[PDB]
């Protein structure tokens, strides 16, 4: 707040700006396909 108040008076102590904090927690999105080595070798499209 910006206190205009009385011009001809001791100037009052204005409230300070507030601060907030956002706790953005990281978490793993994971994929674990158990492909068989057979398909990797036998496919001719590069299945991996």
């Amino acid at each position: 707040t910006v206190n205009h108040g009385e011009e001809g008076k001791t100037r009052e102590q204005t409230s300070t700006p507030q601060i907030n904090e956002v706790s953005i927690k990281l978490y793993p999105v994971y994929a674990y396909p158990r492909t068989t080595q057979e398909i990797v070798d036998f496919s001719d499209v590069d299945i991996l």
């Binding site: 080595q37 057979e38 070798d41 036998f42």
Partner: protein, 46 residues
């Protein structure tokens, strides 16, 4: 019949530590094509 990769030797030394499991793999195949080209002879064995 063989694969294009052939023999592949992967020394897995991680899954069971204190061990090297030397996974050697070869895709092998065999088939009797045109059986008229092959003949068998079973001996009587006495």
């Amino acid at each position: 019949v063989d694969h294009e990769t052939g023999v592949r030797t992967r020394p897995d030394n991680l899954t069971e530590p204190g061990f090297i499991k030397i996974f050697t793999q070869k895709y092998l195949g065999g088939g009797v094509v045109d059986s008229n080209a092959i003949k068998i002879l079973e001996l009587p064995q006495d």
